[PDB]
């Protein structure tokens, strides 16, 4: 389970998720990649599950690059507790996803195998994705 080793502050504001992904939308490590076409949140458990599925499909014959990291903590109230009395406790970590964000890249694997693995992985994710390949510009 991915998580920051250390943080400056325990709890952060909710914020708003707007805009597109102008940074991180270009294939840079592998030859083929999967990128999100819709915005949402990605949790550490989802990242782990997708990685495990892809590795099992590709049989550890190539390298997998993970380009999303969960660094935003999310709190929840203990349950059967009334409103007020301070902010809740940290329960899990997420990464904000904007359209165009590349999630995984694969290097050193046949294209059909990579597409099969990505198709398997996409069924575990809470947003719509698409497949891209390296281009000159």
């Amino acid at each position: 389970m991915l998580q920051p080793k250390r943080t400056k502050f325990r709890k952060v504001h909710k914020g708003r998720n707007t805009g597109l992904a102008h940074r991180g939308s270009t294939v840079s490590f592998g030859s083929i990649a999967i990128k999100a076409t819709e915005r949402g949140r990605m949790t550490a458990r989802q990242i782990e599950a997708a990685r495990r599925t892809i590795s099992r499909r590709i049989k550890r014959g190539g390298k997998i690059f993970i380009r999303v990291f969960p660094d935003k903590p999310i709190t929840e109230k203990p349950l059967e507790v009334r409103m007020g009395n301070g902010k809740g406790n940290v329960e899990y970590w997420v990464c904000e996803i904007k359209p165009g964000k590349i999630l995984y890249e694969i290097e050193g694997v046949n294209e059909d195998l990579a597409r099969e693995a990505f198709a398997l992985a996409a069924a575990k994710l809470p947003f719509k994705t698409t497949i891209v390949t390296r281009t000159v510009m």
Binding site: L20, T37, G100, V136, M137
Partner: protein
């Protein structure tokens, strides 16, 4: 010679955010040509022609001819903007060569 792009002029009333969005709804692409010894020129291209040209690897190394009316410019592709989620081309830079 191998690559010829037909272009129209892009006057000052066709520049800005609204005009560019109208062009892309009409399925054209704005582009800019700059380079040594002359003043930059703004043109517009066709999306299908641009996509077909980019489909081949040799296009990024050769000298291409952009024709707008009677005149003609010999250029090379220098930069390119793509839509982050759809990958459709949106703008192009050409350096005179």
């Amino acid at each position: 010679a191998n690559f010829v792009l037909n272009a129209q002029a892009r006057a000052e009333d066709k520049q800005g955010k609204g005009a560019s969005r109208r062009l892309r709804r009409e399925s054209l692409v704005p582009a800019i040509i700059y380079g040594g010894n002359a003043e930059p020129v703004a043109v517009t291209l066709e999306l299908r022609e641009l996509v077909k040209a980019l489909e081949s690897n040799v296009f990024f190394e050769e000298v291409v001819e952009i024709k707008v009316g009677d005149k003609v410019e010999n250029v090379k592709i220098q930069a390119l903007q793509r839509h982050p989620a759809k990958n459709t081309p949106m703008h192009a830079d050409f350096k005179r060569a």
